[PDB]
Design a protein around this nucleic acid. Structure first.
Ligand SMILES: [Zn+2]
Length: 265
DNA sequence: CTCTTTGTTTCTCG
DNA sequence: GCGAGAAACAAAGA
């Protein structure tokens, strides 16, 4: 989710910025949605200038004019390896540098790469309808409140859409709703102003805490946020606030962990 | 064997 | 448009 992608972004920023790409190889070229041979031709010999993030998307800034947009989906994992590192089964792509290589692996093959130009990045995210970053500066509670008032959607699935605010997935949506004492099936037009305020702040605070702790490990695999989870994967354990048993249900196809006392239906 | 579960996004169907 | 269900894929457990 956003905190894990941010953790990877920071680690990569530290290590590969300034590196010339010597070569690029694929064993699974079909995950390059803009075309693998095209990407190899355009990026070979270019230097990595920066790594940015928007929501759950990583953005490699490569030369002045290219942006490689990468989504890790369910299982994508990057690692920095020596040039002689052996192949592992689900490795799909590598960018080779002079002194090491960046390898992308993805057991389920869901993750994507798209090569687009610098001036097309903002239109790309507008087209995806990605909502604001989860910061006090960008995530305006007033617009959030108005969108929730207008909808009969259930809060968990509406938060997962990425349109009200970017970066929540199954772990942090469950954690946030427990923190804000809101049931995941609550229709959003039933939420009162004070609950919306607590939700807004809890989204920002949980994701910032998860970033600080290097994400949850259930690059970026040394996180400590998993030790702070209150409900996700905690079925049958007791709520830290009230002592009721955490329950698990299915909401719009997703596993959903909540306290039935603290999160009233 | 069959079913279910899983850090996601985006489709069809009615 | 909406919600339900499932595709894309792989692995593991009941
Ligand atoms: Zn509780």
């Amino acid at each position: 989710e956003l905190p894990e992608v941010e953790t990877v972004r920071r680690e990569l920023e530290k290590r590969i910025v300034g590196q010339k790409i010597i070569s690029i190889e694929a064993t699974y070229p079909r995950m390059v949605l803009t075309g693998f041979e095209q990407l190899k031709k355009e990026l070979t010999g270019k230097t990595i200038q920066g790594i940015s993030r928007r929501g759950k998307y990583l953005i490699f800034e490569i030369g002045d004019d290219f942006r490689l947009i990468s989504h890790l989906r369910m299982e994508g994992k990057y690692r920095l390896a020596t040039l002689d590192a052996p192949r592992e089964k689900h490795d799909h792509l590598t960018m080779k540098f002079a002194d090491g290589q960046l390898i992308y692996a993805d057991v389920r093959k869901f993750g994507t790469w798209e090569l687009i130009s610098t001036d097309q990045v903002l239109p790309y995210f507008l087209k995806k309808k990605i909502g604001p970053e989860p910061t006090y500066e960008d995530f305006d509670e007033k617009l959030f409140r108005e969108k929730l008032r207008k909808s009969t959607k259930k809060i968990k699935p509406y938060l997962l859409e990425q349109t009200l605010v970017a970066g929540l997935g199954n772990i942090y949506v469950d954690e946030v709703l427990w923190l804000a004492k809101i049931h995941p099936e609550k229709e959003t037009n039933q939420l009162i102003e004070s609950s919306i305020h607590l939700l807004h702040d809890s989204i920002i605070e949980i994701l910032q805490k998860a970033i600080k702790l290097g994400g949850s490990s259930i690059l970026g695999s040394t996180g400590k946020m998993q030790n702070e989870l209150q409900v996700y994967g905690k079925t049958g354990e007791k709520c830290s606030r009230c002592g009721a048993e955490i329950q698990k249900i299915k909401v719009a196809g997703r596993g959903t962990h909540f306290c039935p006392v603290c999160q009233q239906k």
